[PDB]
Ligand binder design. Structure first.
Ligand SMILES: Nc1ccn([C@H]2C[C@H](O)[C@@H](COP(=O)(O)OP(=O)(O)OP(=O)(O)O)O2)c(=O)n1
Ligand SMILES: Nc1ccn([C@H]2C[C@H](O)[C@@H](COP(=O)(O)OP(=O)(O)OP(=O)(O)O)O2)c(=O)n1
Ligand SMILES: Nc1ccn([C@H]2C[C@H](O)[C@@H](COP(=O)(O)OP(=O)(O)OP(=O)(O)O)O2)c(=O)n1
Ligand SMILES: Nc1ccn([C@H]2C[C@H](O)[C@@H](COP(=O)(O)OP(=O)(O)OP(=O)(O)O)O2)c(=O)n1
Lengths: 197, 199, 198, 198
């Protein structure tokens, strides 16, 4: 018996690469706010943790800050996944899944998370599977080419992201592909693929 | 309802400074392993996580490795706190409480955990309070003086602890006192204070 | 049970950027003062606190004065939110919510409020939520474009606001939108969006 | 009805100058924790506001930091004053009253709080007075001489307090006296005077 078990409605997760337009997509559901629990733009949380901008720290110094950043992401996802609601539908930008299967895996591959950090995160992930209910009935996948995602990143010009190369978006694209198209992860619910190009 | 709620027996937590003799104290319950759930010596997990020595890394490079270390410690305690058991008594060495109120706080004060690392841990702690049941019926506090703790640490001579100064033990001591004697933490359960300075 | 809880009639909040025409819009209800509790334009209070002009001090030296300024705003908002009335309707210019979600947040982002100052405001907001009932049934959002709000500010020529750039209104605009259109903020009640570009 | 009205046990406030021994005195009630709501040593909060040491910022730069410092002290006192409890006795170290009648007043008199900052804090106090219930049935005054207070402060050697002059303890002593001995403040409940020079 996990925390939040039996307390959650049908849940949609909006996934896709950086700059795939997840927030822009979720904005369309604004009029329906009375019947949908909408939990959007988690990134504003990660830029302001009682004043501290973890996102900024992460990109500057990933070998020191990537583990607390991803730890804090994991938490905010958990807080959203388990938030109470009397509404019959919940829709969320991202999830604990993209953190684990995409961004944490990529940061291990590129070396920003050393084994000890990766290990600590994965052991947390495993304990979270045992202890906390994560409701997920549909994933909407906003699929893009790495190049379109990079354009939207350059256009948006978030300062924290000023040094993000195309290769990093290519790496992240393949991981989203591995999970959402090629069924290479143990999760595990329905997926609707949308062309966001 | 929280995870592990209603699943846990009377639970005793053995607390005290580094080198206070917590494992030794818990050792004397071994002969009753079949009547008691004993979860002892968590430091052994921290020294080998799929081969990685987080304790050693923390001590060598706290500013990089203190956050992931405490985050792993928090996990191992939660793993122990929520462990299912068919016995009427559980006794554990340490708790999530001393990682939070003593070690994480001291690493904050000393600069080992930057403010965004500390805030991340604190935010995790608040969410753990909401989501995970931590059974705590009695705390046994092996109260020592920092000098006695320090001597036992030098005797034991763990390579990881080779550079630990007495000042750190004094800091840790006052924090255990603030929590277990002076009831300065929101945590409240019965405390039994033993003199752990003798033989 | 909170202070003012169950004491308040249906309550409307008028919100919008600086210069968006909140007091003007509220002036239309003047003739109905006897059936409506009308609380406008709070800036008159911030310009004269027993003779101290805090709005002017804040613009001149924000690193020292932004914090007691927003603290006073918060207080005058609470005074209005909880002000007693035997009328069936209350209408108010601004609210505690815009101070928190728009003005305090922007002063944090621009450095006017150092961290300890922002933390202190936020912790107060958390306590106020626990202790004080803030009736909020409808927000009327006077939606303007930054350039239109800026022109009105220049036309008006309050001396306190003489150094306010267009950029600042652009930041405040995005924060009103984030709150009132995109509902990124915890507080929810119905919002009526009006075009106040004229 | 004010917030927390009717929810509070008989409440004892422990007051005295800096270094008068309030925490030490309160330590004596530790064994009775299960029957007494004990709220001690609030200075640990003022030193770690999500990692920010407001106490240190105030002493370093009082003209900038004294206002948010006292604003936060006031909050913490309110959080304690209104904390729920099933216990039949509540004992708190310090109170909102001493922030207002002693420390805020002295920082006004020495210039650390300029008029508009002081005005903001006082207007808040008046609102708090109307909206929040503060239970206070007995004040225990640990009376000292400024010299004993000053010696204890030097001996404790808190880094934040290293530049604290004797004059400042003299000023604070007289304000506590004004309030707790000479009945100069609007507030009244019973006062128990104790010689803490011992
Ligand atoms: N587990 C995660 C999640 C996000 N990020 C980073 C990548 C970006 O720098 C920033 C925001 O990325 P998202 O794709 O989550 O949010 P966007 O605002 O980019 O999404 P969109 O533009 O699609 O609305 O956070 C990260 O490092 N690890
Ligand atoms: N939250 C924690 C818990 C422990 N430690 C460190 C301090 C020591 O370097 C090591 C083990 O300390 P403990 O007091 O937990 O265990 P001991 O085996 O030293 O206890 P005893 O000697 O009393 O059996 O881990 C830490 O940094 N953070
Ligand atoms: N929490 C707040 C509220 C207002 N202000 C500032 C912005 C202006 O300099 C002045 C008043 O702005 P308002 O938008 O509240 O009032 P106006 O009178 O400008 O509104 P309108 O022109 O729409 O009537 O106070 C501030 O710094 N912080
Ligand atoms: N409204 C207040 C209350 C306290 N302080 C400051 C003065 C000291 O620098 C510090 C702590 O003082 P207290 O007298 O409240 O606490 P102590 O711990 O010194 O009390 P004691 O030593 O008597 O237990 O906070 C302040 O500036 N304003």
């Amino acid at each position: 018996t996990k925390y939040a078990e039996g307390t959650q409605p049908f849940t949609v997760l909006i996934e896709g690469n950086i700059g795939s337009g997840k927030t822009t997509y979720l904005n369309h559901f604004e009029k329906y706010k009375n019947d949908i629990c909408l939990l959007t733009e988690p990134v504003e949380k990660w830029r302001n943790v009682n004043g501290v901008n973890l996102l900024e720290l992460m990109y500057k110094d990933p070998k020191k800050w990537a583990m607390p950043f991803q730890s804090y992401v994991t938490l905010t996802m958990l807080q959203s996944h388990t938030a109470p609601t009397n509404k019959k539908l919940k829709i969320m930008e991202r999830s604990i899944f993209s953190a684990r299967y995409c961004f944490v895996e990529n940061m291990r591959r590129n070396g920003s998370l050393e084994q000890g950090m990766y290990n600590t995160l994965e052991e947390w992930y495993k304990f979270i599977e045992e202890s906390i209910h994560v409701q997920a009935d549909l994933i909407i996948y906003l699929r893009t080419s790495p190049e379109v995602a990079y354009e939207r990143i350059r256009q948006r010009a978030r300062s924290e992201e000023s040094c993000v190369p195309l290769k990093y978006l290519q790496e992240l694209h393949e991981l989203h592909e591995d999970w959402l198209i090629h069924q290479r992860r143990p999760q595990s619910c329905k997926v609707l693929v949308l062309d966001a190009d």
